[PDB]
PDB file of C-alpha atoms and ligand atoms in Angstrom:
ATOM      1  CA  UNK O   1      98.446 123.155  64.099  1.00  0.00           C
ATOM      2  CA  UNK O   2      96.801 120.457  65.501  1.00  0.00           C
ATOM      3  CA  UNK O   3      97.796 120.197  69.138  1.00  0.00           C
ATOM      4  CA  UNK O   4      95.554 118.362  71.366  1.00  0.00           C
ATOM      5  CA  UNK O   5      93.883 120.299  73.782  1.00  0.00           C
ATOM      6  CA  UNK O   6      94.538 120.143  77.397  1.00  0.00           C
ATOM      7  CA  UNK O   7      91.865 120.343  79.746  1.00  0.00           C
ATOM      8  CA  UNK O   8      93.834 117.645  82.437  1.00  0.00           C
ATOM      9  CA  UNK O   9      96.883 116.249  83.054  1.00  0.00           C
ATOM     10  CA  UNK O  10      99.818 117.408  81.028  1.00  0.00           C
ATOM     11  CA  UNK O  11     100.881 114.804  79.147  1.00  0.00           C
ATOM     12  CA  UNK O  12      99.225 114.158  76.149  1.00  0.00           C
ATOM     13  CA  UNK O  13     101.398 112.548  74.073  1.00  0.00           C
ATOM     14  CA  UNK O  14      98.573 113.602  71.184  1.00  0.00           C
ATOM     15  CA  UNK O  15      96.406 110.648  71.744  1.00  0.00           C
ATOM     16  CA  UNK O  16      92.549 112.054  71.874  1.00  0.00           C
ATOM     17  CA  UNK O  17      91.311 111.001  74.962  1.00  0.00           C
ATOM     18  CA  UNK O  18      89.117 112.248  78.427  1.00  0.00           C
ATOM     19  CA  UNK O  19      90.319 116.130  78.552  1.00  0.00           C
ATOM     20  CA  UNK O  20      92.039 115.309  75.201  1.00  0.00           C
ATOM     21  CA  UNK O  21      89.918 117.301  72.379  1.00  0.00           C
ATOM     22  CA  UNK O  22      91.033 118.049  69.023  1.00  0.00           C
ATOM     23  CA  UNK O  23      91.326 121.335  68.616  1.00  0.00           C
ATOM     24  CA  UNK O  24      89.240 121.715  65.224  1.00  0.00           C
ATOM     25  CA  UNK O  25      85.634 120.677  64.679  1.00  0.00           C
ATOM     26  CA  UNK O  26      83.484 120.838  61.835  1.00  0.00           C
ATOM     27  CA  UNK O  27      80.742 122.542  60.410  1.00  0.00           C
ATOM     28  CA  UNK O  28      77.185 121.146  59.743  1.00  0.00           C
ATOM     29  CA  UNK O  29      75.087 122.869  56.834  1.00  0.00           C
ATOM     30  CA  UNK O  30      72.162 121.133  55.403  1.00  0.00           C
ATOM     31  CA  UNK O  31      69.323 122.555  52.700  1.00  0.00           C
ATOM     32  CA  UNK O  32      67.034 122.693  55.492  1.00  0.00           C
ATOM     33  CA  UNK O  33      68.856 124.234  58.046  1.00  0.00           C
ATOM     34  CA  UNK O  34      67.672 127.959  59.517  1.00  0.00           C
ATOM     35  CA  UNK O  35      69.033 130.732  58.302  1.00  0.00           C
ATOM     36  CA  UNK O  36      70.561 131.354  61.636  1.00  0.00           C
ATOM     37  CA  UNK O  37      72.840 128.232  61.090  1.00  0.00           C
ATOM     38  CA  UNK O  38      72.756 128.148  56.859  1.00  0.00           C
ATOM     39  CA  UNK O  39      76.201 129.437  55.684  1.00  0.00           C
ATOM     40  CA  UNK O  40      77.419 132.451  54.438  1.00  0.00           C
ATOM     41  CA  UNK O  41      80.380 133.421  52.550  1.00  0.00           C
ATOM     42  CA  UNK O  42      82.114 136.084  54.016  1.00  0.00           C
ATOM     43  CA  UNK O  43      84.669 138.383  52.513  1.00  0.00           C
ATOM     44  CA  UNK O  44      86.947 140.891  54.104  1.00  0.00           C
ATOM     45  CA  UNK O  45      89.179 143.485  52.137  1.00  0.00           C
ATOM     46  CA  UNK O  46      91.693 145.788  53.600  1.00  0.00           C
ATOM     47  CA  UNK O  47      93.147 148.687  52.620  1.00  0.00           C
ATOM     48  CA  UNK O  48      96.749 149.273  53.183  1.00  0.00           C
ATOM     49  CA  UNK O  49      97.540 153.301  53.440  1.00  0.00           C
TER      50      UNK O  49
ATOM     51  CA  UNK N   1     111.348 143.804  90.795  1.00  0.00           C
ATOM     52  CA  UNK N   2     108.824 141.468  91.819  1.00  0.00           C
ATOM     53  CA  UNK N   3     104.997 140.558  91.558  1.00  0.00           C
ATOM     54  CA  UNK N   4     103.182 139.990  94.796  1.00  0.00           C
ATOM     55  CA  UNK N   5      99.253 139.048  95.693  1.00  0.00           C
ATOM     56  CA  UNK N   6      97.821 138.300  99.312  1.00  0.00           C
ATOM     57  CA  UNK N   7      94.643 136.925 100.320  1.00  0.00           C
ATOM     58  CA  UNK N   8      93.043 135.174 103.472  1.00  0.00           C
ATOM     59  CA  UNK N   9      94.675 132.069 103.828  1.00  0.00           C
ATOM     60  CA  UNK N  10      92.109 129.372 104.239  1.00  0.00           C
ATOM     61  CA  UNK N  11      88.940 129.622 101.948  1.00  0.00           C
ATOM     62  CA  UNK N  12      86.638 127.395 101.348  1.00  0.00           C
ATOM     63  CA  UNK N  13      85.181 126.146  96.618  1.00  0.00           C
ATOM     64  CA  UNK N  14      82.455 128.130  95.877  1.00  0.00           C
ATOM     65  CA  UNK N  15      79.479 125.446  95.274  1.00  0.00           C
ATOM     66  CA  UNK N  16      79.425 125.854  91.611  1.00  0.00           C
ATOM     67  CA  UNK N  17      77.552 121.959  91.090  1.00  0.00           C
ATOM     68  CA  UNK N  18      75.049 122.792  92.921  1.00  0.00           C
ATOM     69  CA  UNK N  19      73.558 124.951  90.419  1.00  0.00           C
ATOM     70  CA  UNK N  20      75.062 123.722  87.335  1.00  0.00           C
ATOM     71  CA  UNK N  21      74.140 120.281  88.401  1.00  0.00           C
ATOM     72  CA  UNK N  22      70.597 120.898  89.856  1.00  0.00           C
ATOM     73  CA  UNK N  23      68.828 117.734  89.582  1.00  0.00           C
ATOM     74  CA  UNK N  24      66.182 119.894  88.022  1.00  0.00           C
ATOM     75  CA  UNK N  25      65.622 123.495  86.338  1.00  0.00           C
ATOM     76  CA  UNK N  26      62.786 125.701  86.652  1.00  0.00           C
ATOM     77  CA  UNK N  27      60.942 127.307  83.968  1.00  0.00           C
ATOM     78  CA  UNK N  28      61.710 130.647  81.910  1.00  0.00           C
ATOM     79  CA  UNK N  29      58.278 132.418  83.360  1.00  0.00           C
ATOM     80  CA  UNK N  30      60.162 131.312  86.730  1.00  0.00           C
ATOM     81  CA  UNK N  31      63.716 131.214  86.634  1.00  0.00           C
ATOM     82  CA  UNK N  32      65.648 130.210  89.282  1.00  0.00           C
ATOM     83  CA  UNK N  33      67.946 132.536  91.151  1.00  0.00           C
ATOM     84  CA  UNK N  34      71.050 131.824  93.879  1.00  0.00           C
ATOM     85  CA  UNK N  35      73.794 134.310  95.283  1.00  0.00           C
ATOM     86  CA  UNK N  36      77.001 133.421  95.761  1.00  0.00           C
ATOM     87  CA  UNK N  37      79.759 135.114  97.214  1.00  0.00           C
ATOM     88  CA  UNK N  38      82.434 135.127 100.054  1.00  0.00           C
ATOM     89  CA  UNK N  39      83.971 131.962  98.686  1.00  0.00           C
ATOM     90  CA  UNK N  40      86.330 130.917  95.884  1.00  0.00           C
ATOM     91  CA  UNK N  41      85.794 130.404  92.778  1.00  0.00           C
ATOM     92  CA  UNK N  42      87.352 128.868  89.554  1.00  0.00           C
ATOM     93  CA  UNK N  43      86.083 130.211  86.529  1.00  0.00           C
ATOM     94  CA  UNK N  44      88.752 128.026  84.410  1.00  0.00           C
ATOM     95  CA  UNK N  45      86.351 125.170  84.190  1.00  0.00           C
ATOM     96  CA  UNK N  46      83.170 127.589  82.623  1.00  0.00           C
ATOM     97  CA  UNK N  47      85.982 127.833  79.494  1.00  0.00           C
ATOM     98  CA  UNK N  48      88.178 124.484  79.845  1.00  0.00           C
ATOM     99  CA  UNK N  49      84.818 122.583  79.467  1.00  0.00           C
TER     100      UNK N  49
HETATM  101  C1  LIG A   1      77.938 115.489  90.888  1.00  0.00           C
HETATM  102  C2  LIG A   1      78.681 116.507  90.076  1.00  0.00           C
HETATM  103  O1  LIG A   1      78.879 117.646  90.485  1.00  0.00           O
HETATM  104  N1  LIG A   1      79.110 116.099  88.877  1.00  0.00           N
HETATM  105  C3  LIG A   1      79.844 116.958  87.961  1.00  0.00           C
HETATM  106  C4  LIG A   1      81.176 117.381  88.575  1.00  0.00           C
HETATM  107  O2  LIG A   1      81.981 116.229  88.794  1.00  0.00           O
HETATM  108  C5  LIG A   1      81.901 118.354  87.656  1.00  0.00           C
HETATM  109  O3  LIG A   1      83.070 118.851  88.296  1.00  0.00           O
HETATM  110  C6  LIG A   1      80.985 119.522  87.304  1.00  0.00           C
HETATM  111  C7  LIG A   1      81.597 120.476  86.306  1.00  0.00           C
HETATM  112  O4  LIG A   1      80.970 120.366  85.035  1.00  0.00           O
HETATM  113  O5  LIG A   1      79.776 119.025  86.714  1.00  0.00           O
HETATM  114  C8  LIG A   1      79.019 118.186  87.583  1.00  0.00           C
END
């Protein structure tokens, strides 16, 4: 979903605004970023028993 | 049945833009340091911002 946030009043009407935020924001990853911020793939199995 | 809370009836915002909107910081090798207490605070905005 992509809801606006609500961080005011409580209409929205989902029209991004002042205490209207989308509620996704994206990633920034660059060659000479730090390894602190360069990405990583992660992968999570789990076992059903 | 029912869900009931008390508290003192008048209370006075706890000066949260004071610190959080010093005109100026100090430095790490001197952070600053305030108390607070015995007044209301809203810790909805530390999140909702
Ligand atoms: C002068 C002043 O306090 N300005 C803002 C205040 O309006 C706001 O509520 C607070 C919370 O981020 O940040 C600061």
């Amino acid at each position: 979903s992509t809801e606006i946030y609500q961080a005011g009043s409580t209409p929205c009407n989902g029209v991004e605004g002042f205490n209207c935020y989308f509620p996704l924001q994206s990633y920034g990853f660059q060659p000479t970023n730090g390894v602190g911020y360069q990405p990583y793939r992660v992968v999570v199995l789990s076992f059903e028993l | 049945t029912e869900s009931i809370v008390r508290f003192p009836n008048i209370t006075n915002l706890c000066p949260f833009g004071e610190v959080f909107n010093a005109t100026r910081f100090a430095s790490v090798y001197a952070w600053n340091r305030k108390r607070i207490s015995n007044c209301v605070a809203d810790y909805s905005v530390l999140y909702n911002s």
